[PDB]
Design a protein around this nucleic acid. Structure first.
Lengths: 53, 53
RNA sequence: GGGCUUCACGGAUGAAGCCC
RNA sequence: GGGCUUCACGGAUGAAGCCC
């Protein structure tokens, strides 16, 4: 795993076409921004496992 | 972009081979954990352009 | 503008509630 | 466990400083 400590308002990248922005804190929550083309998928842990239903 | 608001300790998934956990928050910063195979790249925005120089 | 919480298979720098 | 800040091309559940 590649752990990083990104400042709010900045971003991270993956592959050559993906970006993972950090919009900021939300208390015990955090608002992240996953940016990828529709060529790939993006879901949360409590919803990916909800598909097998 | 697909914005979401996760809690600390939860996670996100991408490309069916990548997992993006939220390890926690640190004031103006956040700690994320990019889990991807070494078959693909992952770099921060402030150093993706550092490679180009 | 700030703090906390909740909703959201949602592709949008998402949404709603409480307090100052 | 909680609050603030700084250093990290680093694939590691990264690092350092101040306070309870």
């Amino acid at each position: 795993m590649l752990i990083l400590t990104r400042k709010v308002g900045e971003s991270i990248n993956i592959g050559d076409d993906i970006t993972i922005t950090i919009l900021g804190v939300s208390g015990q929550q955090v608002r992240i921004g996953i940016n990828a083309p529709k060529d790939v998928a993006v879901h949360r842990e409590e919803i990916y496992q909800r598909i097998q239903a």
